[PDB]
Every structure is written in structure tokens, then in C-alpha cells.
Amino acid sequence: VSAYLSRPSPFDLFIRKSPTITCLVVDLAPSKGTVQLTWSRASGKPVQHSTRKEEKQRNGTLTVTSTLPVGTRDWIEGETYQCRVTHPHLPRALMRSTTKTSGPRAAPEVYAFATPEWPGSRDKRTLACLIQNFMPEDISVQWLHNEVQLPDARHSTTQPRKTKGSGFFVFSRLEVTRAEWEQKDEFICRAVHEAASPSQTVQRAVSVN
Amino acid sequence: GVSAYLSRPSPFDLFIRKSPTITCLVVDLAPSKGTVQLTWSRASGKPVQHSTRKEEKQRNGTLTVTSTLPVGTRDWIEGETYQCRVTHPHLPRALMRSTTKTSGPRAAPEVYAFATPEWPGSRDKRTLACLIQNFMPEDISVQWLHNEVQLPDARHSTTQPRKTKGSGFFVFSRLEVTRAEWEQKDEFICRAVHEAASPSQTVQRAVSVN
Numbered sequence A: 001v002s003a004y005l006s007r008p009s010p011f012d013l014f015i016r017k018s019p020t021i022t023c024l025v026v027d028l029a030p031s032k033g034t035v036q037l038t039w040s041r042a043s044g045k046p047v048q049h050s051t052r053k054e055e056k057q058r059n060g061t062l063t064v065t066s067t068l069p070v071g072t073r074d075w076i077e078g079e080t081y082q083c084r085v086t087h088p089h090l091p092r093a094l095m096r097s098t099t100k101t102s103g104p105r106a107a108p109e110v111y112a113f114a115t116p117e118w119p120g121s122r123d124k125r126t127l128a129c130l131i132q133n134f135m136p137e138d139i140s141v142q143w144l145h146n147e148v149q150l151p152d153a154r155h156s157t158t159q160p161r162k163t164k165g166s167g168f169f170v171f172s173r174l175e176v177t178r179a180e181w182e183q184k185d186e187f188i189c190r191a192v193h194e195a196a197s198p199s200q201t202v203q204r205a206v207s208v209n
Numbered sequence B: 001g002v003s004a005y006l007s008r009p010s011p012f013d014l015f016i017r018k019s020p021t022i023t024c025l026v027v028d029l030a031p032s033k034g035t036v037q038l039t040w041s042r043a044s045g046k047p048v049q050h051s052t053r054k055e056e057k058q059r060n061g062t063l064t065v066t067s068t069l070p071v072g073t074r075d076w077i078e079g080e081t082y083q084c085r086v087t088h089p090h091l092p093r094a095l096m097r098s099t100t101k102t103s104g105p106r107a108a109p110e111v112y113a114f115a116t117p118e119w120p121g122s123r124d125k126r127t128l129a130c131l132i133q134n135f136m137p138e139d140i141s142v143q144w145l146h147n148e149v150q151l152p153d154a155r156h157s158t159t160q161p162r163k164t165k166g167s168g169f170f171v172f173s174r175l176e177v178t179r180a181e182w183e184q185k186d187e188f189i190c191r192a193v194h195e196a197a198s199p200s201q202t203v204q205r206a207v208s209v210n
């Protein structure tokens, strides 16, 4: 039985201005599960109504999540949120907490590239974006074509890794089709980051050819 | 509480260095102060070389036992199966992990090497990026070469193998370079070592800062 508690995404926090946090508990012994995820703040101030969600997994196991809307200003100013997990079987005591990361801020550098044709694959290319030298590690990455944001499922972004310096980097991968680049041969990699500017976003355009 | 993992050799060790090893990792959340025995064996009945062993007590109060077994290069490539049998006086039953070269779907990697443009304020630095994709199985080794010489491993960072859309996996390798280096010789090579690559289990691509 493990428990995790994530921070808001930069996209939700800055662009949407409706940040949330998610208490995720991955069980390894499901039974009569009246498992409770209790929310609180370090300050003692009221928490909003949260959303509980449970999904039975294929490997004969129960996964339970609770999502709490947080105040944008409350998060930025440094509030700490706490998820308490109470389980019947376990000795009733498990706590996870989250708050905005501290430390220096640094804006991301964004670089976007297009692969050349590989023999046997004329009607597709792979677009690669390198986002680097940012801190903290929290970052949202999106792709756009015709200034419409592409579904998130279309790309995959790597987890933040430290550079040889103090900042982090991610890579993002996007497969595109001939029909798309023939319609408009320009794709935008956009990184949303708090230290980024202006509007907490930095983006770079790339073309096939 | 007891977990065991058996890894395959790195393609670099297997095909370039030709000293492959396999590693049996045993994780124990609640150390019942006793001897977790790791035994190596081959399916063929042939003898195993002497293996290393290392017990580490972790921060979370847990015992991690790792054992590395040197393996014949020809033996691995011709389909030998290696087994790790884990045992402890007080446990349900013996955990048995086996490993062998894949007989399922294979696919050589596509390799693409890129160089970042100049960023304002950093004209004396560039980042080299390599995309390696559509390979399977996931086992892959990445080297960077400059002056026909392999750079130190700690110089570059490779991402974890992720599933592409379609089939196979991708990784990205990242290499920071300085002006001194590309002015001396403006040609860096990203080489991928992968079992499905032909004819020599390698695919590589050069890039220049220009």
C-alpha cells in the first residue's frame, strides 16, 4: 500500500487558473475498502470539496484517487496541503503532503526539430522538442498545429532530469502525418513554466522541410 | 515483501566489449535477519562462472541483495537460459527468475542527431540531442564519439525507453558540448547499440554545430 501526492500542473495553475492536486494511493491488498482520503491545510484553513475516484486495475488491485481544487493564490503564496490515508487493515496512520517547490527560478530554453525521411516511411515524420535549463522541474509541454492544441495522447514527454548544471530538461516526441504538414507545415512546441515569460509560456516553431 | 528481478546484458557489453553480465536483484522490505541465498544455473546444465554479490542496507530499513554473473558471449547469443534461484530459511517458497535472448519481434533503431542553435547569452555552449526510435526489444546502449573516441558515460544522459505509437520504443540522449570541442572538430557521433541492428548491432549518426 503506497500513497503519492502531486503538485498542480503549470498549465492548470497559470493558463487555466484552476489548479488541483491529486492524492493517489496504490493498494496491494484490496478487501472491504472503506479507505478514506482526508484533506487538510497546514494553516488550518478550509479545503474545498474534493473528488474521490476509484478504478479497479487489471492486476487484481484497487487504485483510489482524490482530487482537490486549490486556490491559485493560495498555492503560489506557499500553502501546504495534506492528504491522510486511513485503512482498516493497516495500523491506521499514513500521511502525504505537498507545497510549491522552493529555490531559484530559471526560464526554459525551447528547441524544436524535425526528423528527415526514413526509408519506407514517406508519409510521416517525428518532431522532437528539447526544453532545458529551467527550475524548478515542474513544467507543462504542449503541441500546436494551426494554433489548435493537439490532443495530449499524440505526444509523450520525458520526466524531468537534471542537466550538468542546476536546471532540468525534458524531451517531447510528436509523430505527425503528411496530411498535416501539407495542410500547414508548421508545428509549435510550447512549454508552460512559472519562470517562463511572457505569460509563463515559451514556444518554438518547427517545419518539416 | 520479497521481490526479485533478473536483467539481461547491456548491448554494449554483449556486442562491443564482449563481456556480458546478467544481474539478479533481490529486494526485501522486512529483513528477517538471515541469509537470502542466490544460486545461479544454466538450462543446459553447463557450469556458471563465479558471480559477485553485494548486500546493501537501505535508508528505509531494507535489505537489497544483488549478484552479477559473467556470461559467455557466444552462449548468450546462441540462446542459453540463465536462472537465479532465491531462497531464505523462513519464506513461502523459492523464487525462480530466468533470462534469455528474445525470440519475439525485433526491430532496428532509427537514429537522428540534432544540434541546438545558439541561445542568447550562451554562444560558447551547444546541446547535442539524439533521437533513437522504433526499436525492439527495449535493451539499448548509447555512446557519443568525438575524434573517433568514445566520450565518458557521465558526459551524456539518456532517457528511459518509452513506448512509441505503433511499435517499439524510443530514447533521447542529451550531450552538452563546448566551443573548444566543436572548433577543434565539428563532428559528434551518436551511436546506438542494439541486437536487431544490422550487420554489426550498431546504428550511428553524426551531427555538427555548424
Ligand SMILES: *[C@@H]1O[C@H](CO)[C@@H](O[C@@H]2O[C@H](CO)[C@@H](O[C@@H]3O[C@H](CO[C@H]4O[C@H](CO[C@H]5O[C@H](CO)[C@@H](O)[C@H](O)[C@@H]5O)[C@@H](O)[C@H](O)[C@@H]4O)[C@@H](O)[C@H](O[C@H]4O[C@H](CO)[C@@H](O)[C@H](O)[C@@H]4O)[C@@H]3O)[C@H](O)[C@H]2NC(C)=O)[C@H](O)[C@H]1NC(C)=O
Pocket: A002, A004, A006, A024, A026, A028, A057, A058, A059, A061, A063
Ligand atoms: C497493478 O497495476 C496498476 C496499474 O498499472 C499499478 O498502478 C501503478 O503503480 C505504480 C507503482 O507505484 C504507480 O507509479 C507511481 O505513480 C506516482 C504518481 O505520479 C505518476 O502518476 C501521475 C498520475 O497522473 C497520470 O494519470 C492520470 C490518469 O490515470 C492523468 O489524469 C494524468 O494526467 C497523468 O497522466 C502523473 O501525474 C505523474 O506524472 C506520474 O506519472 C509517482 O509519484 C510514483 O513515482 C515515485 O517514484 C519515482 C521514482 O521511481 C519518483 O520520481 C517519484 O517522485 C515518486 O517518489 C510512481 O511512478 C502508478 O501511478 C500506478 N498507476 C495507477 C493508474 O494506479 C500497480 O502498481 C500494479 N500493482 C503491482 C503490484 O504491480
Ligand SMILES: *[C@@H]1O[C@H](CO)[C@@H](O[C@@H]2O[C@H](CO)[C@@H](O[C@@H]3O[C@H](CO[C@H]4O[C@H](CO)[C@@H](O)[C@H](O)[C@@H]4O)[C@@H](O)[C@H](O[C@H]4O[C@H](CO)[C@@H](O)[C@H](O)[C@@H]4O)[C@@H]3O)[C@H](O)[C@H]2NC(C)=O)[C@H](O)[C@H]1NC(C)=O
Pocket: B003, B005, B007, B025, B027, B029, B058, B059, B060, B062, B064
Ligand atoms: C526501500 O528502499 C529501496 C531502495 O531505494 C527500494 O528498493 C527498490 O525497489 C524497487 C522496486 O522493487 C526497485 O525498482 C526495480 O528495479 C529493477 C531493477 O532495475 C534495473 O534496471 C534498470 C534499467 O535501467 C537500472 O536503471 C537499475 O539500476 C537496475 O539495474 C527494475 O527491473 C524494476 O522494473 C521492473 O519492475 C517494474 C514493477 O516493479 C515494472 O514496472 C518494470 O517495467 C520492470 O519490469 C524496478 O524498477 C529498485 O531497484 C530498488 N532499489 C534498489 C537500490 O535496489 C525499496 O522498494 C524500498 N521499499 C519500499 C517498501 O518502498
